[PDB]
Design a protein around this nucleic acid. Sequence first.
DNA 1: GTGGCCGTTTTCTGTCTCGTGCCTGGTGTCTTGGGTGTAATCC
Length: 92
Amino acid sequence: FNNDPSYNVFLLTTRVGGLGVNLTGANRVIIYDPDWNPSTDVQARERAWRLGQKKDVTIYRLMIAGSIEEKIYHRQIFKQFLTNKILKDPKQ
DNA sequence: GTGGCCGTTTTCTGTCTCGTGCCTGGTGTCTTGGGTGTAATCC
C-alpha cells in the first residue's frame, strides 16, 4: 500500500490491524462501524496518523443518528472523559 | 495455506368413607340427712 501508486483503497477491520503496521501512505480515513473499546480507534487513526506523517490526515466517522450508534458514541465520549479527568483534572 | 481454546465486549359433581369430635346415655363416687342408735342424767 505504501510503495505502490495504485492500490488506492483497502479495508482493514481494525481489530487484527493496528499491532504496529506501518501504513503511512494513507491520508484519508473512513470509520464505518463504532467499536466497543475506545482504544481500538486510536490505533485505527494511527494507521494513517503515524508520528510525523507526510501529509495531513482526516477522519470521517459514520454514525446512524437515532440508533445504538448514538448510545455507543456517547458512551465512548464518556469513556474519553473518564481517562480525560482522572489523568487531567479530577474536578470535571 | 487446517484447526484447537481462550479472549472479549455489555449489565368434576357425586358419592363415599374414614376418622373423629361432640353429644348423650350410662355410671362411678360421693354427701347429706334421717332415723336409729346409744348416751345420760334429772329428782
